[PDB]
Design a protein around this ligand. Structure first.
Ligand SMILES: CC[C@H](C)[C@@H]([C@@H](CC(=O)N1CCC[C@H]1[C@H](OC)[C@@H](C)C(=O)N[C@@H](Cc1ccccc1)C(=O)O)OC)N(C)C(=O)[C@@H](NC(=O)C(C)(C)NC)C(C)C
Ligand SMILES: Nc1nc2c(ncn2[C@@H]2O[C@H](COP(=O)(O)OP(=O)(O)OP(=O)(O)O)[C@@H](O)[C@H]2O)c(=O)[nH]1
Ligand SMILES: Nc1nc2c(ncn2[C@@H]2O[C@H](COP(=O)(O)OP(=O)(O)OP(=O)(O)O)[C@@H](O)[C@H]2O)c(=O)[nH]1
Ligand SMILES: COc1cc2c(c(OC)c1OC)-c1ccc(OC)c(=O)cc1[C@@H](NC(C)=O)CC2
Ligand SMILES: Nc1nc2c(ncn2[C@@H]2O[C@H](COP(=O)(O)OP(=O)(O)O)[C@@H](O)[C@H]2O)c(=O)[nH]1
Ligand SMILES: Nc1nc2c(ncn2[C@@H]2O[C@H](COP(=O)(O)OP(=O)(O)O)[C@@H](O)[C@H]2O)c(=O)[nH]1
Ligand SMILES: [Mg+2]
Ligand SMILES: [Mg+2]
Lengths: 430, 428, 123, 429, 430
């Protein structure tokens, strides 16, 4: 029961899925062969007659490489070969290929496997889609799949984990085009989307893990902790609390306003020494430091519509409430006049678990703060401007158009973004 | 004979606590066997428990939830064994704190299934009094499905009476934003369908626990403890043979002067803390003023704001009936502005020689005060804040609902406040 | 004064002052059941009006559960149909792109033939 | 000569339990029905082939609890399964429910046990209806029954035994509605109604008997004494009030003003030391003091229209008039113009019987007074005001209208209760 | 996936053969075709440019084409020569007499279909064809005529694939053939419409390098081809070697080409070495950075400071610090900010390869899309005009059946290209 299917599109989506699913095994004492020595984890891993615990996951990519590294990787046995789908030719960092030209050739084979995982669901909660904003696969294929699942599964819950493009973390010239087209196409088919600014994950790995030039593994591992912390309330069942979908009600006031900002804490280097440990009040205040934000934005300069705290480890209501109080005095946490100022809290038993030979240290207690601030709209504006610069001179546009796209599909997509921007202005009005 | 229904997380916890406090007060152990001292207990056992021969006593309790979570808590709980396995009616899609889910989409898929159980349980009654619903007004199951059950029952048993234990949402206890939307939709249904409604306020349950019980970190256990106490106190005259010797319909006819004005302000004296510590008896005047004071009302209203249309008060244990009568008449003399003159002899006492569990002297208030409109103004305001901007409505329109249904529920509840108003300003 | 004498009893009048005035003064089963029936008609009719509104509520419940179902199907139709037009307009667009670029080449392929033709004429 | 004691509602039933308890004592009957070794007692008992003398009583209540308590007590044998009629659900403090709703339901069946009780009669004198005033059962149904009794057994007398409501006692907020509604219906149909103000009985069990908080049982110990002191001459071979039609004459001059004021003496306790037992002059003087009055009103400020002095036990007729002669010397005691200033004394030589091992004490001499006074309207004004406050603001009315009644009847009841209030004005000149 | 190569004409085959000498050595292949190298990476992406043969031998996916047997014999008798499949040698005896029309129209066309049969054979052998790559002279007959003819004829058959060229621009500094500007101009037009990307190898720059820098008084072709080859291994590093990409021609094109007509790249390399000379001391990362972005290191005689970079891709080879690299790279654009278009955000991408070339501990390749390339086109137009104005040598063309219109059209199309380059050069974002 309460089943959840994870779909991983493109290079970013797949690589993250690996960081996620690895941690998940560790989180649940599971071994990489599928076997294991609270039945709430079954929401993410299906079980077989042989006793193997196979993830409720689909790995898709228009080119073979990334997926082949898993088909040969240390977890070749953790999944079903059928559930790791690949094309031959990729999307060449072009949405129009990912969406149309190249995706058209895989979509039905992809959807067919989701249907077979859907069958093994006594009562499916919905889908978790991991993708990049800038890849041709991450943008195009994801939007095609989202559209398609909204026919196939109708209004069934669709969640996102989208990697926001940053200059420092690879990136390509056309990425703004890819990210704007994908936001527009998915906007309806999405019920909730968690943005992940690569710069922020770069900044955190630099400033806290002390890594001068962080790897994809380094970022993805940090990301997996945050993602697992968000999904903890679904693989575990504790009396303490643990309760997503509820957060999601407070987090989403209106349908288009479905982008929470994660503010994960504490990020500690695996060579910190004396370190041990941090109080609930340290970790709670940490959530209000912009240095811990999943997306680089300014919510000290933006009004609030929600605030959720997701504790895990060795947390007790006394200090949580005592902490919440210390914060609730300070005037930088300005909520709107149309919604309450309470902070929805959730608490887990299972503390954050660490990866064998990791970059992070093992914390007794961790928190993730999901909030609905008008400051997330900056990430939009940031991206929109970059788009605006090139589109003005129609730079690179021809590669899209050559794949069957229209200039209008860019106007429409941009107008929708300006509406999403206007909508975040309108919402912060008192 | 009364049929007991408990709906949602709140309702099933509240209900489980009533059923264990009263099980001790009637000498029924968690297995369902009489081991009590006086035969005075088994005299009025036929109101709540049935037989199996046995002798085995099964509570006339129907358990409803849209997810198993809470049902299993009860099952795995101490007294949880006593319940008819064939009476646990549950789904798997939790309604998730959405009135429209519990009341329409999800609930409807389990309503007929529940009704069959009530149908069965009512047939095994010589003559039935009415119904007992324990539920929260801010969730989805108790809020939505619980109101749906009341509507459906009203259609099947029109003549039978509707009694409810309706817990009021507060921003103090529970952070879900939508609670005001649910309660306003729930209240609209209660105004029209119940006969007597015990307005248990979480605002007040928390403040009592905090400011007064000196509980720095109040838990649901502590909050529910006061509720269980009051439920046994408001059902003292039903499940116990004394000079009264009355019922549900008689209570309603005498407590309810006007139809809609059927929402009561529960009370209690003394305000006991969980387990710790007991010791030292209370005098009758110490008991009376406590119970008649706002620092004891299970509803967040100041009674010195309105006027009591009708008052009810059950005293427990060995006390001087003289002393009791003496203080009540003194109270009505002193605070005569806050009692309606145009309803004579409107304050009603009751005594019962058997003291409650642990504490050897109790008092349980029930006021039908115009002050209750303050609990509604509160709910209406929280509703309006979000509603003027149409916030969180998508969650409801997604379940088939219309904006009109919200516009009406508020209107109808504002009309209820203007109704409580009329008699607050009225004299002889 | 006297009234009567008996076995286990007796009686006697006792006048204390005379009265100032010598003068003194200064049902159907068909109609009870007609009125009993009358009260029953009323009670039964208001209960019948209560029944009307209660069944009118059942209709509302039927309306909303239906709205939710229709809203999802219209949504699925729109999604499916928008995508149908999107995937077609795309195929349509891209195809003419390639068909024109091949024409441009075939037009240049025409030219080459005439150059070979123009060299033959020159001999 | 036959007499049917009908017991409607919880009061009238518990009250009927106390009286037939006292009759069985006074006549020497066992709780099994048989008696060992003056025929006038049979005016209330029908003998069987087994020599057992079954009471001419019909117990009606709309809930099983009370009547099931009869089928339990030692007197379970005394009555037949047909004469103890119990419905499923009571009127629930609602007059309209007891009359139109749960009434209609049980009426016919209730009249059958009366019919079959009367199909065993040489010629029924009348019926003695016992009931409360403010009960939904002891108001709605009583009034319904009186309607049909006045049709089906027309011309036969009706002697009402009503229990007037009191705050000091287990009273309900709706009682003033039920009280007036019932009086409006049971007015034309009663021939003589003996009110019992529960407040008056409450004080009596306190000041005299020394019971601060008296039980219903203790309060009914005196109600049986007084009701038995009323029925005394019917159950025995007496001369004063030898029939039901005598009270309608001896006390009811104006027909609507049929509410005489009862009075009893001596109110005596057993858990108090022995002394010189009271004389006739002692208990006759006491009979006039409002301290022993059955109903609370000012007799000193009320124009009389009748009087009776029903004695019991070891009395002498000279000593009786020796007390009359001494009271007219000090007190005046006014009377209406159209009425002669005087009593109707009668002595039933039978002794004062008190429950063996009861609250009351064994007395050789005892008296009871029946006095119709304009002063009794001082308690109807109490009730009429309480009614007028609630009805002014329509408080509780919806419940009555919910049972099929009309606001049309709520006014009809008060208008008649204002007309009856004026009858005490037209007379008290 | 795999690339098909075509070398056309004298220059075409000349620079082609050397590319194969360079990259075969780089991949640990001996002249027979037997792999005898250390690293497993030399094979990881070997299929891009080679065919897996019988006896575990590797054979270049290359087609040798010319209208004279001459250079094809030089190649055969040459070092690796026996390495190529001899069926791929599609040769004629006619000659093109440095006449575009003999190549494109008359003589060329007769061999064209025989060539296509061989290209269709190599395309079938392919698992996934990436695109095509042509090495050709722009001033001759076979390279300029038959080269552009093949491009067009291939384009008809594979419109889906990437057409990439190594076009060597004629300078009078290096060749006396007067008609070279005619042939240049006619070929540039074919490029401007039939190639996804073109690397502009200009003999003016090549000569000036070998002379002003390498101080070789009389530079031979062997001396110039050494630069061509150094550049070619460079521009195709990520195509052949496994790194932090992925590795595609289309991906390069979509990022490097903003406007379709403008796909002419200015290659550049650091360090500049003499043919077969032992390197003494290696350059520091700043030296490599500074040099690479200097006019003196450009493979095309245009001053990058006279124009503006639309897109830049720079490839560093050898084991060096990426933080030094990333520091240096960001310094250049922060000081030379005026030479990078603001309307193409983050237009300077950097790839690092741990495998350096032969005899170089560190190399650096530059691929830029500077508007400055107009300088080269202008130089050719002026050279063309001078002669066209006097209808000079035209009967060499009209004698092959050509038209004076075809000529005026060609000049005009060149002129338009320069105006287009100038437009975006002058274009501001405001
Ligand atoms: C203000 C109301 C809240 C929600 C409570 C309470 C919840 C509770 O009592 N909960 C949450 C699960 C159950 C229960 C609690 O903790 C295990 C146990 C002892 C209990 O009372 N259990 C009952 C049974 C029960 C189970 C489930 C549901 C109800 C009752 C019993 O054993 O008798 O935490 C103490 N609280 C003060 C809190 O501190 C919470 N804070 C909040 O919600 C704030 C931020 C203050 N809202 C504005 C949070 C940090 C946990
Ligand atoms: N955090 C993170 N970012 C990544 C990762 N892989 C790629 N990216 C980002 O994803 C974007 C490029 O999209 P890709 O996912 O690599 O491309 P794709 O089209 O979806 O997949 P391919 O066709 O295999 O290239 C850039 O913004 C990168 O910064 C990864 O594992 N972690
Ligand atoms: N003296 C006396 N009064 C009684 C007795 N029982 C009830 N009453 C009074 O009767 C009035 C209420 O009427 P009830 O007869 O008790 O109730 P009911 O409606 O007739 O009958 P139920 O429905 O069975 O309760 C109040 O004024 C009570 O004080 C009794 O045994 N003795
Ligand atoms: C089932 O339990 C009860 C039932 C009732 C009453 C009551 O309060 C004492 C109860 O205890 C809670 C009751 C209530 C209110 C009244 O007036 C406000 C009244 O007149 C009268 C009453 C009750 N009657 C008496 C004489 O107390 C009848 C109904
Ligand atoms: N007092 C009390 N309130 C509760 C309890 N459980 C939940 N609540 C309240 O119930 C409301 C939400 O209803 P809930 O029981 O969660 O939802 P449901 O399962 O959909 O009926 C909130 O105001 C909570 O504070 C409980 O056991 N006791
Ligand atoms: N760098 C270089 N340029 C060459 C080579 N061979 C010829 N060229 C140039 O190519 C141009 C003439 O093309 P060519 O290859 O001779 O004619 P084709 O054989 O008919 O294609 C002139 O500008 C020469 O500078 C060579 O091997 N290397
Ligand atoms: Mg891609
Ligand atoms: Mg009653």
């Amino acid at each position: 029961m309460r089943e959840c299917i994870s779909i991983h599109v493109g290079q970013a989506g797949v690589q993250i899925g690996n960081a996620c699913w690895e941690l998940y095994c560790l989180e649940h004492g599971i071994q990489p062969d599928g076997q294991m020595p609270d039945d709430s984890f079954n929401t993410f891993f299906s079980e077989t007659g042989a006793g193997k615990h196979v993830p409720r996951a689909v790995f898709v990519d228009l080119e073979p490489t990334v997926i082949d590294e898993v088909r040969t990787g240390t977890y070749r046995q953790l999944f079903h070969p059928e559930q790791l789908i690949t094309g031959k030719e990729d999307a060449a960092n072009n949405y129009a290929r990912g969406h149309y030209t190249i995706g058209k050739e895989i979509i039905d084979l992809v959807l067919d496997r989701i249907r077979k995982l859907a069958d093994q669901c006594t009562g499916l909660q919905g889908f978790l889609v991991f993708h990049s904003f800038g890849g041709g696969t991450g943008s195009g294929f994801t939007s095609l799949l989202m559209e398609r699942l909204s026919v196939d599964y109708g209004k069934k819950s669709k969640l996102e984990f989208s990697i926001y493009p940053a200059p420092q973390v690879s990136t390509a010239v056309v990425e703004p085009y890819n990210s704007i087209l994908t936001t527009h196409t998915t906007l309806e088919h999405s019920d909730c989307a968690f943005m992940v600014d690569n710069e922020a994950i770069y900044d955190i790995c630099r400033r806290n893990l002390d890594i001068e030039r962080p790897t994809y593994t380094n970022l993805n591992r940090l990301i997996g902790q945050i993602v697992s912390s968000i999904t903890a309330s679904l693989r575990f069942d504790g009396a303490l609390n643990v309760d997503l979908t509820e957060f999601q009600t407070n987090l989403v006031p209106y349908p288009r306003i479905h982008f929470p900002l994660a503010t994960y804490a504490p990020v500690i280097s695996a060579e910190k020494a004396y370190h041990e440990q941090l109080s609930v009040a340290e970790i709670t205040n940490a959530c209000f430091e912009p240095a811990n934000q999943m997306v680089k934005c300014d919510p000290r300069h933006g009004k609030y519509m929600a605030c959720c705290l997701l504790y895990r480890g060795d947390v007790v209501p006394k200090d949580v409430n005592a902490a919440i109080a210390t914060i609730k005095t300070k005037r930088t946490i300005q909520f709107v006049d149309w919604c309450p100022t309470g902070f929805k809290v959730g608490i887990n038993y299972q503390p954050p678990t660490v990866v064998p030979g990791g970059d992070l240290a093992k914390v007794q207690r961790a928190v993730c703060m999901l909030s609905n601030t008008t400051a997330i709209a900056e990430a939009w504006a940031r991206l929109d401007h970059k788009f605006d610069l090139m589109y003005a001179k129609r730079a690179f546009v021809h590669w899209y158009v050559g794949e069957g796209m229209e200039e209008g599909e860019f106007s429409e997509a941009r107008e929708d973004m300006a509406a999403l921007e206007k909508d975040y202005e309108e919402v912060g009005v008192d | 004979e009364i049929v007991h229904i408990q709906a949602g997380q709140c309702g099933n916890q509240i209900g489980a606590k009533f059923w264990e406090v009263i099980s001790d007060e009637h000498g029924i152990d968690p297995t369902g066997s009489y081991h009590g001292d006086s035969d005075l207990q088994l005299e009025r056992i036929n109101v709540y428990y049935n037989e199996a021969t046995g002798n085995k006593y099964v509570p006339r309790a129907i358990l409803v939830d849209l997810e198993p979570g809470t049902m299993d808590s009860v099952r795995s709980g101490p007294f949880g064994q006593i319940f008819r396995p064939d009476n646990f009616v549950f789904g798997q899609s939790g309604a998730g704190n959405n009135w429209a889910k519990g009341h329409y989409t999800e609930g409807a898929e389990l309503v007929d299934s529940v009704l069959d159980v009530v149908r069965k349980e009512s047939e095994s009654c010589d003559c039935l009094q009415g119904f007992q619903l324990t539920h929260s007004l801010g969730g989805g199951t108790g809020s939505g499905m619980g109101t749906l059950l009341i509507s459906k029952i009203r259609e099947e048993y029109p003549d039978r009476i509707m009694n409810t234990f309706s817990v009021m949402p507060s921003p103090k206890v529970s952070d879900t934003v939508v609670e005001p939307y649910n309660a306003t939709l729930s209240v609209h249904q209660l105004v029209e369908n119940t006969d007597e409604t015990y307005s248990i306020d979480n605002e007040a349950l928390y403040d009592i626990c905090f400011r007064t019980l000196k509980l720095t970190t109040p838990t649901y256990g502590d909050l529910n403890h006061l509720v269980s106490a009051t439920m046994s106190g408001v059902t003292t005259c039903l499940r116990f043979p004394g000079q009264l010797n009355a019922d549900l319909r008689k209570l309603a006819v005498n407590m309810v002067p006007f139809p809609r004005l059927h929402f009561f302000m529960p009370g209690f004296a003394p305000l006991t803390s969980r387990g710790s510590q007991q010791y030292r008896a209370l005098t009758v005047p110490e008991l009376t003023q406590q119970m008649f004071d706002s620092k004891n009302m299970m509803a967040a209203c100041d009674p010195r704001h309105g006027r009591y249309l009708t008052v009810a008060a059950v005293f427990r244990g060995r006390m001087s009936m003289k002393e009791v009568d003496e203080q009540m008449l003194n109270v009505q003399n002193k605070n005569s502005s806050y009692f309606v003159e145009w309803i004579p002899n409107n304050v009603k006492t009751a005594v019962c020689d058997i003291p409650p569990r642990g504490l050897k002297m109790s008092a349980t208030f029930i006021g039908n005060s115009t002050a209750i409109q303050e609990l509604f103004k509160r709910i209406s305001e929280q509703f309006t804040a979000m509603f003027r901007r149409k916030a969180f409505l998508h969650w409801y329109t997604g379940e088939g609902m219309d904006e009109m249904e919200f516009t009406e529920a508020e209107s109808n509840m504002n009309d209820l406040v203007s109704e409580y108003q009329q008699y607050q300003d009225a004299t002889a | 004064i006297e009234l009567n004498k008996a076995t286990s009893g007796q009686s006697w009048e006792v006048i204390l002052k005379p009265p100032s005035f010598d003068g003194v003064p200064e049902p159907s089963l068909e109609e009870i059941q007609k009125k009993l029936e009358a009260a029953e008609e009323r009670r039964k009719y208001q209960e019948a009006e209560l029944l009307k509104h209660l069944a009118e509520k059942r209709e509302h419940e039927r309306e909303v559960i239906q709205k939710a179902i229709e809203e999802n199907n219209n949504f699925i139709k729109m999604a499916k149909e928008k995508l149908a037009q999107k995937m077609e307009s795309n195929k349509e667009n891209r195809e003419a792109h390639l068909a024109a670029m091949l024409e441009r080449l075939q037009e240049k392929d025409k030219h080459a033939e005439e150059v070979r033709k123009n060299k033959e004429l020159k001999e």
